[PDB]
Amino acid sequence: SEAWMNFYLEEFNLSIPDSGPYGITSSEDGKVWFTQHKANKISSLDQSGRIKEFEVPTPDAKVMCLIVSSLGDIWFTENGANKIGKLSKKGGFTEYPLPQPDSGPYGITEGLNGDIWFTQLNGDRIGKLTADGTIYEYDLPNKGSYPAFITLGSDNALWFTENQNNSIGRITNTGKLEEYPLPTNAAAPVGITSGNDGALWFVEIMGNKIGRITTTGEISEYDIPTPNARPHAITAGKNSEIWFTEWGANQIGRITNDNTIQEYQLQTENAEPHGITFGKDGSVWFALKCKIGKLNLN
Template identity: 35%
Template sequence: MPTTTPGRRAPRRLPAAAAGAVLAVAAVTAPARAAAGEVREYPVTTVAGAAPAGLTTGPDGALWFAEHGAGRIGRMTADGAVTDFPTSGPDTGPAEIVTGPDRALWFTETAAGRIGRITATGRLTEYPVPTAGSAPGGIALGPDRALWFTEAAGNRIGRVTAAGAITEYPLPTPDASPHSIAAGGDGALWFTELRAGKVGRITTAGRITEFPLPGGGFPAGIAAGPDGMWLTASGTRSVDRIDYTGHVTRFGLPGPDSLPSGIARGPDGRIWYADGAGRIGRFGATGAVTTFPVPDGGAKVPLRLTAGPGGAVWFTELLGNALGRVRVPGR
């Protein structure tokens, strides 16, 4: 049975923290660097060690984010004002968050093995994932108006309805460690398999196809673009594009220290990514990359990002205990 708790405040502590695909390598263009002033940061003022992770823009126009280190869900307005709501405990490990079909915010609790739902007023409901120790991570709204999520330790893709009914689909590859998931333009859900080095596709009927990532790498974040799915691959310091037939194009990133993680389509229609080495990157129409440095960003670990208020791209700083904003060029 789900548990329901009203929003409240309390101190928190930081817990220990495709087959036959063809690879095409894109030319790497020297990046254009934007001024550091293009980035503005907003601290999470409600709790130290919040470790902001997943991020989305809610139906109310505010930013909602998962406080992985504090067991809370945060809300930030465009001017940086923060309100947060606790989950059922400090060590639940909220990871990713998305707006559901019911205008509530849905999120994964990696440590607790649950899917959470919270309303704009802070009313919380949590649904246990049937597979014990499943470690749910990524979550996305599907074309069937259900929420789909990855189970990193359970090696499954899960589906939860707005009423809380959960169905699980085991992956063909053992120990694949499914990571992130996103709805594609082909009516299916696409996900990354971090340990297996594959990209998966699951239909709303539960049929799974897997595409090995040529050239290796550890696929992590994934998002729909105008021409297929885009994903980050940390082991190869690249961002890859896979079309709906399984053809992969790899785009190398500037800098020998690149650690790409989150990826999203910005308000300008371009693909943006978060680089844990301390910058935010943007792909132009020709594939050229522009980087936006985050002040002292290597110590802050930019992690996830989304199109947000003010026509900007917003991102979380996992260790910086802040959210950041990048003004989109030309806006």
């Protein structure tokens, strides 16, 4: 029984045909949440297929990454408007303007004690937004680093990709920063996630590899079978498994328990998958160019 026989795809069409679905994440209540950067919405998709749209208060906000916090709030970056957004578990918005202009907030994740961490792609700095709404910032030593995705590592430090510095950054709550150069030149890391193995897993969009970096900084790589796949986002699945989107190949990738990569070919024309998440029931969800996609295994 080969893997290609053992999957099936579903799609969920959206209210308007060109809303820019980008980021996607999963909630513990079973809902999938996503950003729509052209429509300027945050939307949920529930277990019965019902969609609820929320209008981002700031126009032309270019909403990018999002997460569901441990309190059930939806936090997101307003890349175009220089703000962090919050949609409360109750359903009201709060927005937090950044202290320096044109920062380009991008990646977002929850840290400890309710702290919300984010990258500033054009700012070349990392931010922390605390319970009382104070923002603290930390400069990267190189300008044009382009810090992209960010995630909470198994060591409780914040790990992020530096797309153009070709490195993985690690920052602690004390502000102590370390950077780990990638072994592949101009690899251009984008997505990062924490694996169930306790390591950080990332994509190299130009390197055409999946990277793994331990919390002590040891890097290993996996060659993506399809050339020019342009991998974008990445998430842990069940056990040691890892799932990722191939924006350039219209494919979903998977590293299985036997440590080999399986690729799944999507049917949607111009699928161009970006964000990816793993549902509580083992569904693999992803943001396509114009709609939401779902992959299930048998």
